Amino acid sequence: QDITLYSGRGETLVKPIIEQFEKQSGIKVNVRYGDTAQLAVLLQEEGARSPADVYWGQDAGAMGALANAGLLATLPEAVYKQLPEIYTSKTGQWVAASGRSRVIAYSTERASAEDIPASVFDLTSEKYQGRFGLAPTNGGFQSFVTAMRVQHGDEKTLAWLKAMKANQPKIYRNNTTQIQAIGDGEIDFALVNNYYLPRFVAANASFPAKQTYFAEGDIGNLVNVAGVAVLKSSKKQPQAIQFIEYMLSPAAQQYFTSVVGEYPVTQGIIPNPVLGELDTLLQAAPSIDLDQLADLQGTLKLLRDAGLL
């Protein structure tokens, strides 16, 4: 038996996972690799004639487009009902395989956790002037801005963006260069996806940065996800579901957090010390319908309006 996976996740991550799944299950996985969003476009063009059984992406906005388009099969309750609400479609059309959240990284040499305000909205304060980075071309930042628009609307979001720009940020290409800039002394704070600093700490346990959360429920703690779903058109849904269940198994979850540096979605996983306990993430995370992150174009407009793009 064999299934077809459309994977927005990179092969260096995917291949060890699918190879071990194949060895344990006897099911061969044929993978089409691509960009998460472009593969969602392709699925919509293929419609009911898609060869894909499983879609595994790393941005909730593209998954939301597929959910809205009616292309995703409802998963068995046994797969999704035990998962935290931040990690599953409420109606079971997809589940997170790992968590890719927003955090604030800070300098351990020039700052401390006491400098972290209650809300990401508070970073417009003069206390932070000239001390933070921004990567407005980064997909994680852009999806975070979409989530801010979903929760608070465009006028509050645009006011924040303009005030962040009026505070005097240093602009960086991506998350890695922001974390490097913290260590280099260019900035003291950065808004980043959670899984980059663990790389730095793995190469240098003493790297002078930590990362943490804003107050409970703040939009600055948004948990984006590497979501996985079964296509309605699939004629091999039992095997597709078996693949998803494998990715939720303890070995794969431990791999996601110890090797990839992403949060696990189940209990029973030894934490990555840079990330801390899953219970703390669940307390920190805002309640956001991740399917509503599909509206990238409205967010890019706001960033252009604010002069950040």
The one-letter amino acid at 236: K
For residues 26 and 173, membership in a common domain is answered with no
- Resolution at which this structure was determined, Å: 1.9
Rounded alpha-carbon distances, angstroms, from residue 3 to 51, 55, 238, 242, 270? 9, 11, 10, 11, 31
Largest interatomic CA distance in the chain: 61
For residues 208 and 147, membership in a common domain is answered with yes
CA angle 96, 176, 247 (to 5 degrees): 20
Nearest to 254 by CA among 267, 244, 242, 245: 267
CA pair distance 259, 293, nearest whole angstrom: 27
Task: Output the 3-class SS for the chain.
Answer: CEEEEEECCCHHHHHHHHHHHHHHHCCEEEEEECCHHHHHHHHHHHHHHCCCCEEECCCHHHHHHHHHCCCECCCCHHHHCCCCHHHECCCCCCEEEEEEEEEEEEECCCCCHHHCCCCHHHHHCHHHCCCEEECCCCHHHHHHHHHHHHHHCHHHHHHHHHHHHHCCCEECCCHHHHHHHHHHCCCCEEEEECCCHHHHHHHCCCCCEEEECCCCCCHHHCEEEEEEEEECCCCCHHHHHHHHHHHCCHHHHHHHHHHHCCECCCCCCCCCCCCCCHHHHHHHCCCCCHHHHHCHHHHHHHHHHCCCC
Q: Provide the domain limits for residue 236.
A: 1-97+223-276
Residue 148: burial class (beta carbons within 10 Å; 0-12, 13-18, 19+): buried
Find the helix packing angle between 36-46 and 60-68, rounded to 10°. Answer: 10
The one-letter amino acid at 197: L
For residues 116 and 82, membership in a common domain is answered with no
Q: Give the pair of three-digit tokens for residue 84.
A: 């935290």
The rounded Cα 163 to chain-centroid distance in angstroms is: 25
φ/ψ (deg, to 5) at 194: -70, -20
Residue that is written with structure tokens 């930042």 in the block: 141
Q: Give the pair of three-digit tokens for residue 195.
A: 């899984």
For residues 287 and 194, membership in a common domain is answered with yes
**Number of structural domains, the chain?**
2
For residues 263 and 162, membership in a common domain is answered with no
CA pair distance 259, 76, nearest whole angstrom: 29
For residues 6 and 79, membership in a common domain is answered with yes
For residues 143 and 292, membership in a common domain is answered with yes
Q: How far apart are the first and last CA of the chain?
A: 48
For residues 244 and 217, membership in a common domain is answered with no
Structural contact between residues 108 and 182, judged by C-beta atoms closer than 8 angstroms: no
CA pair distance 140, 294, nearest whole angstrom: 13
CA pair distance 48, 22, nearest whole angstrom: 26
Structural contact between residues 97 and 246, judged by C-beta atoms closer than 8 angstroms: no
For residues 301 and 284, membership in a common domain is answered with yes
For residues 93 and 237, membership in a common domain is answered with yes
For residues 255 and 286, membership in a common domain is answered with no
- Neighbouring C-beta atoms of residue 245, cutoff 10 Å: 17
CA pair distance 298, 14, nearest whole angstrom: 31
For residues 24 and 65, membership in a common domain is answered with yes
